[PDB]
Structures are given as structure tokens and as C-alpha cells.
Amino acid sequence: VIPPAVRPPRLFDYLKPYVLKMHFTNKFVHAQVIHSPTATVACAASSQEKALRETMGVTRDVAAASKIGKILGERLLMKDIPAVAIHMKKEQRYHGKVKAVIDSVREAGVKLL
Amino acid sequence: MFPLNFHYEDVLRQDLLLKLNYANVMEVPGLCEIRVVPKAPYNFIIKNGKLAMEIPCGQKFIQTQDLARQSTLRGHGMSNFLVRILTVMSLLDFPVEIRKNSIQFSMETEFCEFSPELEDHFEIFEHIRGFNVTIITSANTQDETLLLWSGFLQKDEG
Amino acid sequence: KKGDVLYPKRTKYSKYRKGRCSRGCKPDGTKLGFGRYGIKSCKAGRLSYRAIEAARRAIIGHFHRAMSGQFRRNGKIWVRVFADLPITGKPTEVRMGRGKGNPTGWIARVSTGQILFEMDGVSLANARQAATLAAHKLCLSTKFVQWS
Amino acid sequence: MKKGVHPQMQWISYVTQSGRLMHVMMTRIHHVGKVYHFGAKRQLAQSIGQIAKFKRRFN
Amino acid sequence: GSTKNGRDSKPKNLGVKKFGGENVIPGNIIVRQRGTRFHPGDYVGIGKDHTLFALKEGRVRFEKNKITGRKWIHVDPKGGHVLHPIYTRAAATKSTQM
Amino acid sequence: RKKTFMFIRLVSAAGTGFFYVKRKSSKGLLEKLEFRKYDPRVNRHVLFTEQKMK
Amino acid sequence: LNMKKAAIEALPEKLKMAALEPDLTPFPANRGMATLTPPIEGYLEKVMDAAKKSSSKEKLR
Amino acid sequence: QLEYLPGFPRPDAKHAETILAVPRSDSGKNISAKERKAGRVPSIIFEQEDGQHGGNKRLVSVQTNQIRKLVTHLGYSFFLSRLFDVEVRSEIGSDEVIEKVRALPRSIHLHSGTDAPLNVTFIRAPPGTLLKVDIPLVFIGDDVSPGLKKGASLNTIKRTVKFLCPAEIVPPYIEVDLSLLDVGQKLVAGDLKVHPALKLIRPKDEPIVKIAGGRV
RNA sequence: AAACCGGGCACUACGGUGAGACGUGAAAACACCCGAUCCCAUUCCGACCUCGAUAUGUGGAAUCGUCUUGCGCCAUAUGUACUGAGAUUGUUCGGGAGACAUGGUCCAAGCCCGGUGA
RNA sequence: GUAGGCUCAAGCAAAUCUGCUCGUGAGCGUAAUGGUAUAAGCCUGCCUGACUGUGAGACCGACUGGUCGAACAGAGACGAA
Ligand SMILES: [K+]
Ligand SMILES: [K+]
Ligand SMILES: [Mg+2]
Ligand SMILES: [Mg+2]
Ligand SMILES: [Mg+2]
Numbered sequence A: 001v002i003p004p005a006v007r008p009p010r011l012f013d014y015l016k017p018y019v020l021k022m023h024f025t026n027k028f029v030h031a032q033v034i035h036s037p038t039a040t041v042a043c044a045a046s047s048q049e050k051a052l053r054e055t056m057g058v059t060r061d062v063a064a065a066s067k068i069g070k071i072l073g074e075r076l077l078m079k080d081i082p083a084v085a086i087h088m089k090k091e092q093r094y095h096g097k098v099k100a101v102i103d104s105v106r107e108a109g110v111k112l113l
Numbered sequence B: 001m002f003p004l005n006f007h008y009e010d011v012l013r014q015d016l017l018l019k020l021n022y023a024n025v026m027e028v029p030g031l032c033e034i035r036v037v038p039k040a041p042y043n044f045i046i047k048n049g050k051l052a053m054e055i056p057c058g059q060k061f062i063q064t065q066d067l068a069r070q071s072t073l074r075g076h077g078m079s080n081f082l083v084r085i086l087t088v089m090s091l092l093d094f095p096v097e098i099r100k101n102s103i104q105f106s107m108e109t110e111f112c113e114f115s116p117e118l119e120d121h122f123e124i125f126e127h128i129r130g131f132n133v134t135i136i137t138s139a140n141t142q143d144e145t146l147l148l149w150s151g152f153l154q155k156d157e158g
Numbered sequence C: 001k002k003g004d005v006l007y008p009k010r011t012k013y014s015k016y017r018k019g020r021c022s023r024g025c026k027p028d029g030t031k032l033g034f035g036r037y038g039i040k041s042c043k044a045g046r047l048s049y050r051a052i053e054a055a056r057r058a059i060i061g062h063f064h065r066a067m068s069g070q071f072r073r074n075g076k077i078w079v080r081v082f083a084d085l086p087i088t089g090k091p092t093e094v095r096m097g098r099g100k101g102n103p104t105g106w107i108a109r110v111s112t113g114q115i116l117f118e119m120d121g122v123s124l125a126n127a128r129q130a131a132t133l134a135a136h137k138l139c140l141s142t143k144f145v146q147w148s
Numbered sequence D: 001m002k003k004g005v006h007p008q009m010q011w012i013s014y015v016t017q018s019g020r021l022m023h024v025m026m027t028r029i030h031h032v033g034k035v036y037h038f039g040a041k042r043q044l045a046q047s048i049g050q051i052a053k054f055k056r057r058f059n
Numbered sequence E: 001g002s003t004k005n006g007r008d009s010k011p012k013n014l015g016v017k018k019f020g021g022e023n024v025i026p027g028n029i030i031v032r033q034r035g036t037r038f039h040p041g042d043y044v045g046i047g048k049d050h051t052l053f054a055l056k057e058g059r060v061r062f063e064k065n066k067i068t069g070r071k072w073i074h075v076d077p078k079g080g081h082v083l084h085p086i087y088t089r090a091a092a093t094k095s096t097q098m
Numbered sequence F: 001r002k003k004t005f006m007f008i009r010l011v012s013a014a015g016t017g018f019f020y021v022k023r024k025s026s027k028g029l030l031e032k033l034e035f036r037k038y039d040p041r042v043n044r045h046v047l048f049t050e051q052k053m054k
Numbered sequence G: 001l002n003m004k005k006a007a008i009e010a011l012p013e014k015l016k017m018a019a020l021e022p023d024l025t026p027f028p029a030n031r032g033m034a035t036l037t038p039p040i041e042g043y044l045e046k047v048m049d050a051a052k053k054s055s056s057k058e059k060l061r
Numbered sequence H: 001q002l003e004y005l006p007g008f009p010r011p012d013a014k015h016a017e018t019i020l021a022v023p024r025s026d027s028g029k030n031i032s033a034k035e036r037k038a039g040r041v042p043s044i045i046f047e048q049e050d051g052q053h054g055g056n057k058r059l060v061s062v063q064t065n066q067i068r069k070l071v072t073h074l075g076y077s078f079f080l081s082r083l084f085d086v087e088v089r090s091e092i093g094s095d096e097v098i099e100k101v102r103a104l105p106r107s108i109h110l111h112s113g114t115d116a117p118l119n120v121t122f123i124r125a126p127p128g129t130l131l132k133v134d135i136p137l138v139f140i141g142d143d144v145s146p147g148l149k150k151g152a153s154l155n156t157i158k159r160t161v162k163f164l165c166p167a168e169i170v171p172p173y174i175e176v177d178l179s180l181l182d183v184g185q186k187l188v189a190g191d192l193k194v195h196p197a198l199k200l201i202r203p204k205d206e207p208i209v210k211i212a213g214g215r216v
Numbered sequence I: 001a002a003a004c005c006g007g008g009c010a011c012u013a014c015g016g017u018g019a020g021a022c023g024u025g026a027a028a029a030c031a032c033c034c035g036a037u038c039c040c041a042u043u044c045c046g047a048c049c050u051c052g053a054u055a056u057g058u059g060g061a062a063u064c065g066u067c068u069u070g071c072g073c074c075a076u077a078u079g080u081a082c083u084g085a086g087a088u089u090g091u092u093c094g095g096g097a098g099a100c101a102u103g104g105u106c107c108a109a110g111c112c113c114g115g116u117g118a
Numbered sequence J: 001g002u003a004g005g006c007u008c009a010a011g012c013a014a015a016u017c018u019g020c021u022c023g024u025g026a027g028c029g030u031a032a033u034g035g036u037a038u039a040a041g042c043c044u045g046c047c048u049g050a051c052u053g054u055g056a057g058a059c060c061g062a063c064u065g066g067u068c069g070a071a072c073a074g075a076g077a078c079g080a081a
Helices: A062-078 A098-110 B003-019 B047-057 B076-091 B109-113 B143-152 C048-067 C124-136 D050-057 E084-095 G001-009 G013-019 G044-055 H029-036 H064-074
Strands: A017-026 A027-037 A040-046 A084-087 B033-038 B061-063 B069-071 B097-099 B101-110 B130-136 C036-043 C045-048 C074-078 C085-089 C104-109 C115-120 C142-146 D009-015 D022-026 D035-037 E029-032 E044-046 E052-054 E059-062 E070-078 F005-012 F017-024 F032-038 F045-052 H018-023 H042-046 H058-063 H086-087 H097-110 H117-124 H129-141 H153-156 H160-168 H174-177 H186-188 H207-211
Touching: A017 A098, A027 A098, A040 A062, A062 A098, B003 B143, B033 B047, B033 B076, B033 C104, B033 F005, B047 B069, B047 B076, B047 D022, B069 B076, B076 B109, B076 D022, B097 B143, B101 B109, B101 B143, C036 C124, C045 C048, C048 C074, C048 C104, C048 C115, C048 C124, C115 C124, C124 C142, D022 E044, E044 E070, F005 F032, F017 F045, F045 H129, H018 H064, H029 H042, H042 H064, H042 H097, H058 H064, H064 H117
Parallel strands: A017 A084, D009 D035, H018 H086, H042 H117, H129 H174
Antiparallel strands: A017 A027, A027 A040, B033 B069, B033 B130, B061 B069, B097 B101, B101 B130, C036 C115, C036 C142, C045 C104, C074 C115, C085 C104, D009 D022, E029 E052, E044 E052, E059 E070, F005 F017, F005 F045, F032 F045, H018 H058, H042 H058, H086 H097, H097 H117, H129 H160, H153 H207, H186 H207
16 A cells, blocks of 8 residues: 555644654664744754753763753743643654653653643 | 575685676675475365475465465575575485576475485375475576576585 | 347436437548448448448448359458437327436447548459449438548 | 473483583473483484386296 | 436535635635545634635635645635744733843 | 334333334344433433333 | 785786686585594494494395 | 768758748637538647646637648658648738747547548647658658569558657658568568658567568 | 765655666675564464564565666647537537547655775 | 554566565445545554533525534543654
8 A cells, every 4th residue: 555645643723833843763762842823943942952962971862861851841841831742753652762761851841742 | 604695705706707798796696585485286275285395495375365375485484494495405306497586496396305304294295286485586697696606506416 | 230230239327318410520531441342422421220230231232243253252441430319209199398208229420531431352343333322222412432 | 582482491411412511491391400312313224116016036 | 128227316416616816704614525625724624524714804815735635725814823822921921021 | 114123112111212223133032121321301321121112 | 805805916918817717616525524522533434334334245035 | 970971862842831820819610610611621730748727829710722632642640740830820811920939739530431631730840840641651762672573462560650759850751672572581670761760659679561471 | 075885764656666688785784584481472383463582694585776668647740530719501710538649657856874995 | 542563456577475577446334425544444441522611713595404624611531752
């Protein structure tokens, strides 16, 4: 079969403009919060950063992704974004590093929409 | 540590680099999997047919919709199965067939007759037609497969 | 095909609407597809499968008598028109409406510029005279066309 | 590999025709592991021809 | 002689009820159809027989996908988009305070 | 004329007499239906047991 | 492999076309395989002698 | 090297006429029917370089008697694989020559019932331009063929071959020799003796003519 | 600092999707090469996915480039079919395909993180 | 009903698994038509929203009458959400 192109979730009543997107490589972990109307990066946290890639030993595993999620949640709460909506890619399930990032953000205190 | 894959990595890889034209060291053929499937006319019901498959493979088979039975062997289990069959191969002249990338072997009851560990409990394997054993290799050419099998089939006789 | 008389072995539906056939042209011109000579139509109308078979039989019987021996089958014929529309009909002494009548035969819709027949492997004069003989069995006006 | 689904294994020893030792795994059907020696049991069979059969008698 | 064919069914009145650029208020039925000939877009809901209706007061816009040929119907809202009440409670309070 | 189905009453076991009218086939079964459904006269989900239609 | 590729290019023409031919002769079956124990010295010839003493004479039909 | 090689056919000097045209001011069936009633065939001259934005087109009308004479004398396919001189003047009998150019007849439209010309198309082919030309075939040597002598019949699979041709050396026709074909064999599109600068558009393993055995 | 390169998001059929040939792994990035102990995967299997590990190997599979190209897609004819109004029993005025033919595969382009520049 | 997972049919190579072409041609109890690929299809776990009282606004129309539906209150099922 030919895989059809993915669409963003349908607008129903309210906008919900902040979208959390995650990415994991062999060496680092990245997480971004995107503002949908302007198509800009509102917030970001990754283990590739200059202020983060030396303060943690392992930059690739579940513990590193959980630390990155905690940092991103505190950055969102100081940049005043009370809630985010999670976007999951073609192969990501609620398991492992994705689960660590989501639970770290929720324990940091961001509501999930 | 183990004789079969150690022998492959230490002897056959260098000689297969030297014998053929290769652009890289990752183009060397290797060893992927072993697929064992019983011969066509059989019972589907008796416990002998299930046990005579579970014993020489070492892992549970799959029985799909009851008309098909299969076992796939990968990794160190595949290496143990291969080093058993290649050792028992040295007591006779069992025919094999070389396809484009794989080796076909016929696992008859006369094989388990000569297997020294299966001399006992032979009534399991009695009244069984046999199996078909497939050895899949990552080979581009039938001649690469033939060279690889001729390397792997070693004895101290001759 | 069905040997001589040409109609489909089976159809999707037994009875078809009448439709219209008095109009229609080839909007791009016409050229021969297989043969060197051919017969094409100048008008548009209907032809029955019996008329098409009679015309084909006339051409092959003219070649049969003009050329014998090993050249007897050197003439080749292509029939490019096919009759696949059943026509119906009610018998005598019947009133108007109790459904639709039984099928009686098959027709072909012919447009202006449609090539009915194609000929190869013969002489120019034999082809012209076979076209002359075949056009006397068809109700439509035909022309002899030549490859160029 | 799933758990609670496959047979147990056991270690047995093979001795080749030259006396070389080799350790392998096998499905556990014995109480203790054993050592199995390999011989030259090739069992190659040959049949004589008709001229050979003729010469075995009439000469 | 006897025919066996005299049956038909009552008309169903399908089709597009609100074309492109039409002004709709919430609850209005846009397209009544058998199967999703048109797929729902923004602010357009769908019923159990694939009837498309409008959820916000606005103007009907159509959309076509160029590769696959799929079609969507959106409604452009009259006053623009509305943000979530959690943002209006928190971020708009801090927006007024800053 | 012959009907292949019949109607039954799922009766509330709370004793309020509230019943649902359901439908089952007449080909043959032995397991009497029971469900956990809403009884509005007691405002709680209770157990409903099949009884024959009168 | 890089050094072999460099070695094939420092040859004359016909000598290079000869040495570009792939080797397809199969491996020898009499070369050994490594294992956990070296061969016993008085084992293999003993097994061969026993096998030929068994295969001596002809079996009765 | 842009000249016909020896041993090759050349365009004839008998049919080397010049085509006279006058400008046409509009497109459509109204003005087309008016020009046809007046006795002229509508036409357009265009170039290759800009397929979009028209293509430097000029709308003209040519003389029906001349065009019908050319098509009848040459043949339909032979008229389409030969270059011509086109001379566009402001009026018939005028000397105000607007454009003289060397052009290829890209297509001609004939009525399917009456075969009168309805439209002629001209594409500017000065030297140095590449065209897709459909060249007719001419079959010779059918009296020498042993297969045809033995009573076999001829199966002409293809009549025209499509080539990519520079303008200067477009062949009028391709001579195909049937002297040395016996029963059973066929000629493919790779056996055509053409100029080496012509590229065959169709694959070379395409049959052209096969001599098949007769009904014994 | 302003340019270039790598990764993620965003724009998009002239920006799509296949095939062939030639290259590329910058002190960095991506992927593979290795393993199956815990999480997960398999109605058998680390094949897929997942989880661990890799001072430096390889671009064999994928990923990036350059050209050739096949379908598509975009733009544009000329002519014909068909058609709205009108009866010189359609002598007028308008619209205009399909299939051919000709060219192209553009231009422009935002946010963040990392590196070289600094 | 819900949550999670999976992707058919046909052709070719090996001659029922594994890979390549193609794209709705498989399935959706039941006729035909329209629809459908991280599903509306197939599997597994748990369930009974196959609830109670209402309903802005529309689509059919001689009338009797029929269809879609955001949302409100009570009690619940599945899901980390
Ligand atoms: K279920
Ligand atoms: K509610
Ligand atoms: Mg016009
Ligand atoms: Mg067009
Ligand atoms: Mg799901």
C-alpha cells in the first residue's frame, strides 16, 4: 500500500497552538515546543546544548531523556506556557524515552492537552 | 569463543576478501538464519511430530492456520544447530543443493539415526518423513554461496 | 467472431436502448492501421452483421477467383467494424405495451470516416474492384482509401 | 526469547575423529551431559560390474 | 407477456447544501452523502451517516489534495480562532499584567 | 408468517420493576441473559436479569 | 583490502588483466577447524586402521 | 559534418515548391470557415524555443489548390518528412515579403469524409535544430527474395519509423533491401541504414517486416 | 558577525514518484557495524521495533549530493468534435474540449540547536 | 464500546514463509451503489453508552410524519493521558 500523507489533528473548538515534538538519535535527545500559527520554535531542550552536554554523563538513554524533559518543563513554566499538546511520530509509542520525556514534563507541571 | 563463528571471522573472511573482487569489507557474505519446515505428508495431531521438531531445534515452533509448521533460528542457537549438523555431516555423504543465496538440506530420519545424541529416544523420530532445512546467507552470487559452504564443510578425513 | 457471423458470445445486459446514430465523425482524420488499401464510410448509420459478412464474403470470393495457387491466400483482409448492439422486435398481432420484445439480431454503429475494411497483399486494381463489389452490399456510402 | 515457552538446554561434549574436543548445547533429554566420540563410519558401498563378475568365475 | 421490472425507490435528496463561500451558523448541514465523498475539515463535524455539519459561524471553504484527489470542507470562523480557556485564564492574565 | 425471534424483558433486580425490552433468537440457547445496566428509579447501576415477555 | 587494491594497480597490463580474475576454486576439505583441544597424536591413524580392518574382506549376503 | 552522405537519397527538385501565405488575424471556427469558403487553408508557423507563451507564432493562410496538389503528388507521409520554403507576404500579388523561412510541415489535417485539407502546421527548422521526424519506409528487392520466390507472403509490420533528426539531413525515405531474406526471418529497426547522426527513438529490437511461410 | 555545513520543524507536485551512472562521511552531525541482562518486540525467532554499548571502522542497506531519463504535473498553441442565443427548413454571433504538437521540472523561502569560521 | 498492536488481494523469484512490482482490484453478515489503509478491515485485554431526562440549529415535505446534531444534568465503561 501507499502510505498517505499525515495531517495535523482537526480543529474542533479551540486553537491549542503549542505542540510538543520529540526526537532521539544514537548520541543525543531533543525535544521542541512549536508555536503552530507562526511555525516557530517557542521552546527547546536537548542534550546537545552547550550548557547541558557536559553537565550529564550519558546523553542518550532514558535517564538523559527524563532530565531533558524536566529541564524543558521548567523552561516552559518560566516562559509561561501552562499546557502543551503532544505530537507522536510514525514509530513512537508511549514507551521508553518518549514515556520518560512525557512523564518528566507532566511532573514538572505542564498540563497536557 | 565458539568454534563456528570464530572460524568464520578468523579464517573465511580474510580469504573471501582475497579471492574475490570487493569494494568494501562490509560486502563480504555472512550467515543470517536457518529455517526448518517439516516434510509435506504428516499427521498434524500426534505428539511425536511436535516433539521430533522441538528436540533438534531447541525452540518452540509456530503452527499457523494447523496446516503449516515452522521454526526460524537466528544467532547462537543457529550456530549451535549448524555446528551439530556439520559434525554429523562427516559420517556420510548427504546431498545439498546450492541456490542463488541459500543452501537446501534434507533432514531425513537417516540423519537422526547417525546423530549420536539421538541414538536414544529414537521412537520419537521413528515414523517421521523428515524435515527441510534452509540455510540463508547474505550472498549476491550462487558461486559466493558455493564457496562459503565449501569453506564451512570441513573434516579431517581424505 | 463466431466463425462467419460476428456477434458477442455474451453481453452484460440482454436489451439495450435504441440510442442515436445519425451523427458523429472522426474529429482527427482517419488513417489505415494494418493494410495498404481499405474501405471507409462517408456517411453515418447502421450496418447489420449479415451485411458485414456478405461484404467480407464478396471480397474474399473475388480474391479467390482473381488469384489462385500460392497467392490465393496472399490477400489479407481485416474487418475493423464489429456488430455488438442487439436489436429487438415484437411479432405480428400484438398490442403495444407488455414489456420489451425478444432480440432478433445485431447491428453496428458506423461513424463518418470509420474504416470498415482493410486489404493487403493484392494488386491495386483487385483491391479497387473488390471494394466496388463489397460496397453494393452495404446501405451506406463508402470510399476506397489508399495508404500514403 | 519469551519466558516459559522454550525447552531447557544442556551442555554436551563432542570428540572429532582426530581427538579434538568441542562443547555444544542441546535440548535437555538426559540427566547429565555426556561425551560422544565420532568414528569413520562412512559406510561406502560398491557393486561389481558384469565383466568383473564374468572374470571372477571364468578365469 | 409479463414484465418483472416495475420497482424503484423514493428519492433521497443528497448533494451539497452549502456551496463555497456560503455563510453558515452552527448546526447547519453542509453535505448530505453516502460515504465520505468529502472529508471533514476544521470546525466541521460528521454524523453517523457521514453527514457534514458546521460547528462555528463562518464561511464554507473547500480544499482538494493535489496528489490523491481527496476533498475536505473547512469553515473559516467569523471572528478568527479562539484560544483555549487555560491560556485565557493564565497567559492572558499575565499578558495584561505585562 | 412464522417469526424467528422473540422479545424478552431484562428486569431490574432492585425490585423497582424497571425493565428493558430486548430481543433474542428462537433457534435455541440455555444461558439466560444478564447485564449491569442503569436503573433510573434508584439512580445506580444494578443487575438486570432476563425474564419472559408478558 | 586497501593495500591489496593498491598492489593490483602497480602491475603491467596483461599481468594485471590476469590478476583481476576472481578465484572460484573451492576451499580444501582437509584443512582443519579450530577448537578447544589439539588433536591426539595416536588417534586419527588408529581410527583409520580400525575402519580399514572392518572394511577388510567382504560381507556375506 | 551536416551533409547527406553518398549512397543516400536526397529530396527531389521536382517537388521543391515555395509555399505562399498571407496573414490571418484571428482564431476560431468562424474565421476558419470564412477562409475555407474563400479558398484558403488556415495555418500557423511557430518555433521550438518557448513552448509556453505561444512560441513566436504567426497565424497565416495558404492556398488550398497548392496544398492539395502537394499532398496528392507526394503522399501523406512523404509530405511530412520533407522541408519546405515558406514565404509570407502581406497580400497575394504584393511584394511586401514579411517572412521567408525554411520550415517543416509538422501536421496536416484532412477531413475524414471528404479529405479536403482543414489545417496545416509549420515549425521553423533552420540549420542546427533538432526535430522528431516520422520517416516512411520503401521496400525494394521483392523480386529477388528467395522466400517470396518460394510462395511465401509478406507481413509489413511497420510502415513509418520515428527518428530524432537534425534539420539538414532529414531523409525523405528509407530504402529497405529484401534481396537476401528467405522464409522465417524478420528485419528489426536496428538494421536501417541511416546517417550516423540520427538517433532512433524506438528500441532497436522492434520487428519491421517478417517473411512467413505459406499454407502448404 | 556574516556566510557555509549537519539535525529537527515548517513551505511544496515546475517543489511528486521510480530507474541508471558518478561521487560524498568535514577534528562535527546522521546511520550502520556489536549484544539481548532489565523495559519492549515475535500467535517461533533481536527479521521489525525496543533497550544498552561504540577516542573511531564503513557509507556495502538506508541518508546526502551531481547529471541522464520513464510516468506524472505545469504552461501554451493550431484545427476538429460538441454546445448557448437565433430559424434564410439553422448562410449569424459567442463558448470550446479529448487525442495530437511545443517547452519546462523554475524563482522565492522562515524558526531553533550544533560545528567550521570566529 | 474502548485501549493497544497489525495491513490485505493479485504477479514475479525461490516452487507454505521470506523479498521485490502494483494499487482498491481483499474484507466490511445480508442486493446494488458510494466509502474506507496507524481504517470503517484483522487480533488481544477489559466491559455493556444495545443508558435515563432534555436539546441551539438545520435537511426532506400536502398533511400525518422522518433524518443529522453541538451542548446541559445524573449514573457508568475503557484509557497513563
Ligand atoms: K473488542
Ligand atoms: K454528559
Ligand atoms: Mg476562440
Ligand atoms: Mg488540451
Ligand atoms: Mg488503534
